[PDB]
Design a protein around this ligand. Structure first.
Ligand SMILES: Nc1ncnc2c1ncn2[C@@H]1O[C@H](COP(=O)(O)OP(=O)(O)O)[C@@H](O)[C@H]1O
Ligand SMILES: Nc1ncnc2c1ncn2[C@@H]1O[C@H](COP(=O)(O)OP(=O)(O)O)[C@@H](O)[C@H]1O
Ligand SMILES: Nc1ncnc2c1ncn2[C@@H]1O[C@H](COP(=O)(O)OP(=O)(O)O)[C@@H](O)[C@H]1O
Ligand SMILES: Nc1ncnc2c1ncn2[C@@H]1O[C@H](COP(=O)(O)OP(=O)(O)O)[C@@H](O)[C@H]1O
Lengths: 436, 435, 81, 443, 442
């Protein structure tokens, strides 16, 4: 389940918080940033309460300060069965959808409906199957013996059950699941009988089982529109769904909640790099947040006073002031030496790399000096240099060798700036020849 | 249970029978003149005599333009069509922007049809076709818990019955007017014919076979336009898997529109349909190109144009698509002649305090008096929307300390945790690299 | 008006070999509704529409002889193939 | 004899067992530290544990960056998928650039599955259909069942088919006396050809004649297949392979790139993880190579910043020859190598160095011995001085006109005079520019 | 046929030692460029190396396209020569890189060896069995020569080829098995009882004698791009003519490369590379140049010839100026053939050759005045004047162009210098760049 090699945020299992929403210094893979974690815990409580809608928050700070780490912590603390959509700023610039339509689809993907239904099921291990044919074979008679670990029974079959058993061959000793009302029979496997391999089911054979469904508003939006089927949820060409089906879906969902047949589960939409949206997207986002079925929007940006896209002026955070008026802003700060070394030790534990104390100190020094991501990339590349000399622990010499082999930002700018005759400039001039 | 999103304390304009507005009634505080002008416009819409009337309401940000348009929509009632819109939605990659404007115009004119639902439901007891090979009629006997009833049927409904594979003992649903046939399932009394079968068993209906009900259908002109202009062809009732070719939005010819108008007028003359004109509302009108602004001039001169309401917060701003045209509110001078402008005023301290108290009441929160004074001072110092957004984290921080009433300390912690635009810009200015 | 068939038989296109085949082939995504035979009936009708699946192939010749001579069904009443 | 084009003298990085590069090994001359860093990257890829690791090959023109990427691909072997790409490929008129980038990301991850196939095969002996009682009833088809009798070497089976398999059998145009191949996973039918048990000299359809298949009729055989994740996504988004009318009509439509949703990717990942948990499939992550990375827009870089943080991402290798250059799509952002500072933080830069005169001389030596040419020593010294004076590449591709001018004088020796004639007939960039400046009408 | 611009150039005019003759094969002068083009021609004919870029540069009206046409005519048959312009890359349904990939793959030919069987003889009896609807078709054919007579079996395509091009008994047909082509050679029986339905006057041919079935080996050249388009989808053979080949995937190209290498490894097919010619290559985006720089390094890459008549000008897609309008990375991997302007004797020889091709009997003094006006003005103007002078000369009903008709044609039709001289003194009559004009004459 959920195959993954190692992620860059794989150590974050949530927000480290107490029962009084106080952040521990080291919990759940998150260290430091006490005020930002407290604010994100308040936002998490806002989402889990579910009584308010359409509030936008902004996580702003310098680069490499843990904004995406905060978003991943909120997403892991939400758990399953709550919608979480994560998009980038450049994702909505489509050739087949308008920008407002893509933003609308991303908005309605983040709110879901919890529907609870029950179905009656058959589960057991097949003992013996008899199919009988007549002289002409016009009618078919049958008997099926099926057992669990507690009972055993024999059923008399009709024509459509016999046809459904002949199709998708079922032999003796197979564990199968039968849905009577739909006629779908699945082979769970084979029982443990030497004389795939699953165990024989226990308890009753006729079980009424309850399955809790959660379906987003965008799925019912696609299915209710007749212009395409449910295969557009996978192929991805929905093609500018009309508004009137969305008002029908809104009214139907409202009366479903009134009757008690459904519950509304709002979620979080996360927009990473929100400064790359046009001003039309910002103006749509301003008026899309006052709807009753609107999620809580999280935006993350790292710019200063920069040019807003599609305009000719400059704005704080790259966003216009009317969008910033409806936002509450969480500010992240830079890290210390101890926080950097704790981050590097946690990244060592997740990458299964054993480090010396001196190697950790050198990594902390070069991480304070250059970048946190540079040391977090150097630590995994030092282990291969250590393993080429056939030893397990990563020492100082491996870190110095990796620091010599792989450059960083400021050093690369420094070697470029006194060798610029060999590189292609903004004017397209270069010197390739060695002499003259 | 109950959700709240930036509104829903606004219930109406809050006017008396003379058209004058009270101070605090209907969820509105302040702004008497804009509310009275909007009530006059609501009366004009209810008169149902004029077409192509354009109103612009202008003012600063967070002054109450969208609340006024929502109050118009609540005062008109659910019967009148109301089509809210943002100006950025008129740009699409499928059709031109003028065609999208035409569709949004025609979405605001509605119709009311009075129809009757007639339903036969029960267990099939007799199914006897007969030849007149072509069958002339089939006789179906239906049974419920309150008796049985037999029906003659046309052969088309027998064809639809043969589509659904209906045998003796199935519970079916027949609609008399449309002719739709739905098979609910085999009846519960025939459930022990086999020990195991692929058929679902449903009980008998406990009511009568015959059911009669009067209903009202509300459609718009755009529904008839898109129903009469399917390019691929008429879709069936049920298509779980998609159409083989993707149907794309097209440029609907005005000949189709005049045919739809002719048919609708013919049905109106017979007393079947009722014409309900409505309101088209375009928020952030400064985000329109000049070509849409030119097309609005001819679109307002049609005989079936609705009442159009526009909003803007800009000042003397260059019109989009132009480079040397400076016009008030971002609206070009050719179009600005055709409207009537309703001015909207900023608020005072006491109005801000009353708005904050009303928002705390609708969100089911209790606040202290000193917390209310601090929130009012914060609202006058930063913005009105900041205190309204900061009201709910104050309630959460009061909840985590096992209390039910917000005090000054929770407001101080919420002010510490979350910033406004001014303090964020102050941090942005005095920073080394990118905040 | 017959350039294409002349280009077909000029370059020996009925004796060339196929060079590409796809890597993965899949049926459409199954939709499951628990406890409803109507969904199964509608899905089986959409996937295996008899008019359309009959239109994309033929009828056996002896079966056509059983239609036309032993049953008196005219050729214009055949499901077209 | 063979065909050579600008490469194929490079057979790998040419390192030792400890990671130390030799001076001349694998067709490489010099660039020792770059080759050692590339060997460390090769070991990291072969470890099969890391996701979203990005390196950047930064240097001048003609310093051997594409050669190093080719050596990476040759050292990893053909089992690991390698996806070469230029920066201009991502601008498609059918779909957005973000989807093309994610498609190449999923195309850079491989898979190896051992698949069991249920197979019926043999020579068709009897083909007899049975009719329906009311064939014009509107619902239900014309026939009910088709009896097919197949025979093999020591075996004969008779099968009763539903109509749906028979429609594929009829579409394959089978008859009595043909060897067929029915597979039961998708219902696909392959018609092999006529059986050899009859006469083979009385046909006009240029068909080949096969004998009977050995073994029984019903088999279960194991097949090892190598697929990528993008193949699974493409096969699921445009479904062909079933016997339903959606699948048969999917083959006849013109193909078009669509925006594959994230839901399909998560479901394909879940199915692949369930396959791996059963001991059936194994995962082979690979390398995506993007050349001329300065041709990308700011939006593609901003999407790369998020695409590298996924948990299934491959190892990405970039290359650029740019100094302080404005990023495309921006007007004021000056950044090293034309790559924005948000991406440089997630990168490890490998720097390539210019060459020396002796390195130019021996590179010309290997390029001469690969193109099956022999030169004199004085002509080689002239070519090395020429490569230092103008460019390495201009000295590299002057070899073939020299060889042609040597051949046309009935000699198998490249001499100084042939190199002088190649100078007289072909120019370089500097002399052409010098002609262009002292010209009347842009000569 | 019709007369084109370079209709007098069929070849390059080179000796066995790659030394150009002063006037041969329609080409006169330009010795160094002709020698370099002959070297590139032998470089193509060897077929041992791939992906080499050649740039031809010089002033306008110099003979760059003449050199490209000479290379194409000296290339010979069954070698692909794709000649495109720089403006054709930009398309509404194809990307620029995809269009460049298709233009690259058009220039590589694959020569496939095939084994066929030929059958000729008189038809004795045709039996055709068909269904009631008409889909399933089968039958037997009894063909006969003087010595042998066998019975064959027929399929759907063979019956379709028999029905159209109606064959009766007594006709002599020729059948090719691997191509599926039926040609009727004539009739021999001369059947008496003819139903008078058609107006056939079929030829009387003799009885074919000898072997009925003969084998032969045939060779045909197909392009690589045709194999991708055929293997791309179900009806790609239609897309080969309609041009509806939208963005063929990379997996198709990989599998086609693998199968082409497999066919080469057995001896069925061999690879014949060709020349891709790009005229006006400066009319290209910088993304096209960045793609070309890395598409020249592949195994299946043709030799690319480019022509430019541009100096240090702006490179498209950028905001700087570069030599020949091309970036320095593309100019690094190119060898450059330069072309120089002409003399008076070369211009006289050019005009005499173009007069010989267009069949115009020019006088001596008419040729001298044409040379004079071709050395003051451009060469193409004096080349265009010859047909007009001829058409003026036939109005006087004499088949010899004098200097009077040449003077009349020079008076009637203008040069560029006379046109700018007339425009620049009457600027009110013509529409200004600011859009102002004077229409009234008073
Ligand atoms: N407080 C923290 N606790 C644990 N890991 C952190 C913290 N802050 C940053 N990191 C790690 O640092 C790396 C880079 O930080 P990131 O969140 O990408 O920066 P940004 O906020 O600019 O996106 C990530 O892998 C993240 O896991
Ligand atoms: N007179 C008023 N009484 C109560 N609430 C108001 C009033 N005016 C504005 N508001 C509130 O202010 C919030 C923002 O106002 P809004 O309608 O967005 O103004 P604008 O559209 O001009 O920005 C709304 O949630 C609305 O409820
Ligand atoms: N170390 C080396 N040994 C041998 N040949 C080399 C070496 N480095 C470069 N070359 C050759 O020089 C040319 C450089 O081309 P390429 O590497 O594509 O350009 P860049 O260096 O700009 O990436 C190639 O033809 C390559 O064969
Ligand atoms: N050496 C030559 N031999 C024959 N014709 C020539 C020669 N040089 C020029 N021409 C003629 O002069 C014209 C030159 O134009 P062209 O080659 O199309 O453009 P450019 O000379 O700018 O490359 C052609 O029409 C060609 O017929």
């Amino acid at each position: 389940k959920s195959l993954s090699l190692i992620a860059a945020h794989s150590h974050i299992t949530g927000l480290g918080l107490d029962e009084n929403l106080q952040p521990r210094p080291t919990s759940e893979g998150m260290v430091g940033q006490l005020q930002a974690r407290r604010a994100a815990g308040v936002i998490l409580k806002m989402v889990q309460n579910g009584t308010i809608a359409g509030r936008a928050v902004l996580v702003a700070g310098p680069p490499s300060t843990g904004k995406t780490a905060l978003a991943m912590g909120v997403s892991q603390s939400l758990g399953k069965d709550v919608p979480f959509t994560a998009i980038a700023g450049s994702e909505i610039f489509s050739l087949e959808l308008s920008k407002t339509e893509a933003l609308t689809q991303a908005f309605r993907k983040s709110i879901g409906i919890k529907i609870k239904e029950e179905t009656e099921l058959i589960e057991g291990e097949v003992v013996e199957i008899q199919i009988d044919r007549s002289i002409t074979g016009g009618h078919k008679q049958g008997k099926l013996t099926i057992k669990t670990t507690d009972m055993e029974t024999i059923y008399e079959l009709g024509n459509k059950m016999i046809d459904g058993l002949t199709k998708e061959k079922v032999l003796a000793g197979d564990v199968i699941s039968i849905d009577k009302a739909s006629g779908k029979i699945t082979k769970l496997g084979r029982s443990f009988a030497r004389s795939r391999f699953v165990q024989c089911p226990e308890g009753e054979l006729q079980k009424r089982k309850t399955v809790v469904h959660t379906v987003s508003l965008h799925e019912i939006d696609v299915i209710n529109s007749r212009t395409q089927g449910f295969l557009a949820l996978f192929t991805g060409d929905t093609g500018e769904i009309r508004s009137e089906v969305r008002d029908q879906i809104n009214t139907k969902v409202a009366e479903w909640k009134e009757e008690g047949k459904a519950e509304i589960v709002p979620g979080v939409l996360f927009i990473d790099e929100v400064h790359m949206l046009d001003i039309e997207c910002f103006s749509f986002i301003n008026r899309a947040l006052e709807d009753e079925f609107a999620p809580i929007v999280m935006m993350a940006t790292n710019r200063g006073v920069s040019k807003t896209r599609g305009t000719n002026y400059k704005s704080p955070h790259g966003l216009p002031l009317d969008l910033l008026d409806r936002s509450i802003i969480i500010t992240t700060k830079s890290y210390n030496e101890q926080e950097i070394k704790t981050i590097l030790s946690i990244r060592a534990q997740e990458e299964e790399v054993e480090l010396s104390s001196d190697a950790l100190d050198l990594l902390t020094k070069t991480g304070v000096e250059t970048s946190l991501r540079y040391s977090s990339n150097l630590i995994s590349v030092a282990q291969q240099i250590a393993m080429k000399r056939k030893n397990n622990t990563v020492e100082v010499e491996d870190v110095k060798r990796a620091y010599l082999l792989f450059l960083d930002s400021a050093r690369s700018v420094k070697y470029v700036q006194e060798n610029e005759s060999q590189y292609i400039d903004d004017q397209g001039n270069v010197q390739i020849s060695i002499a003259k | 249970v109950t959700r709240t999103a930036a509104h829903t304390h606004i219930k109406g304009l809050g006017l008396d029978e003379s058209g004058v507005a009270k101070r605090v009634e209907g969820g509105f505080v302040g702004q008497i003149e804009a509310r009275e002008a909007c009530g006059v416009i609501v009366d004009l819409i209810k008169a149902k005599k004029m077409s192509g009337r354009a109103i612009l309401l202008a003012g600063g940000p967070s002054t109450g333009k969208t609340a006024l348009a929502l109050a118009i929509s609540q005062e008109l009632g659910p019967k009148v069509p109301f089509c809210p819109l943002v100006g950025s939605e008129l740009y699409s990659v499928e059709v031109k922007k003028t065609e999208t404007l035409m569709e949004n115009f025609r979405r605001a004119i509605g119709l009311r049809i009075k129809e009757t639902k007639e339903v036969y439901e029960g267990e099939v007891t007799e199914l006897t076709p007969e030849d007149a090979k072509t069958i002339s009629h089939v006789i179906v006997g239906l049974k419920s818990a309150k008796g049985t009833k037999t029906l003659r049927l046309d052969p088309t409904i027998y064809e639809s019955i043969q589509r659904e594979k209906v045998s003796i003992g199935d519970v079916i649903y027949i609609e008399a007017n449309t002719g739709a046939v739905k098979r609910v399932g085999r009846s519960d009394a025939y459930a022990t014919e086999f020990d195991l079968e692929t058929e679902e068993y449903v009980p008998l209906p406990k009511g009568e076979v015959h059911k009669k009900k009067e209903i009202v259908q509300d459609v718009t002109l755009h529904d008839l336009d898109v129903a009469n202009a399917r390019p691929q062809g008429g879709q069936d009732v049920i298509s779980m898997m998609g159409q083989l070719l993707k149907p794309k939005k097209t440029e609907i010819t005005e000949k189709l529109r005049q045919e739809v108008n002719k048919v609708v007028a013919k049905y109106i003359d017979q007393g079947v349909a009722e014409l309900i004109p409505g309101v088209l509302f375009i928020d952030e009108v400064n985000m329109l190109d000049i070509e849409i602004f030119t097309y609005l001039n001819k679109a307002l001169e049609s005989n079936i144009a609705p009442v159009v309401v526009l909003a803007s917060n800009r000042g003397m701003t260059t019109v989009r698509g132009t480079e040397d045209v400076i016009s008030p509110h971002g609206v070009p001078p050719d179009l600005i002649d055709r409207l009537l402008i309703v001015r909207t005023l900023p608020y005072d301290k006491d109005e801000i305090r009353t708005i904050i108290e009303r928002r705390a009441t609708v969100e089911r929160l209790q606040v202290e008096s000193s917390a209310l004074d601090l929130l009012a001072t914060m609202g006058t110092e930063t913005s009105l929307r900041y205190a309204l957004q900061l009201l709910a984290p104050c309630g959460i921080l009061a909840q985590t300390s096992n209390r039910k009433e917000i005090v000054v300390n929770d407001v101080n912690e919420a002010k510490l945790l979350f910033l406004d635009a001014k303090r964020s810009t102050k941090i942005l200015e005095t920073s080394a690299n990118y905040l | 008006l017959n350039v294409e068939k002349h280009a077909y038989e000029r370059e020996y296109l009925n004796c060339i070999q196929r060079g590409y085949h796809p890597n993965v082939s899949a049926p459409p995504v199954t939709i499951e509704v628990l406890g409803s035979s109507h969904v199964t009936n509608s899905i089986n009708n959409e996937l295996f529409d008899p008019l359309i699946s009959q239109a994309l192939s033929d009828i056996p010749a002896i079966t056509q002889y059983n239609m036309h001579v032993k049953k008196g069904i005219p050729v214009e009443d055949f499901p077209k193939t």
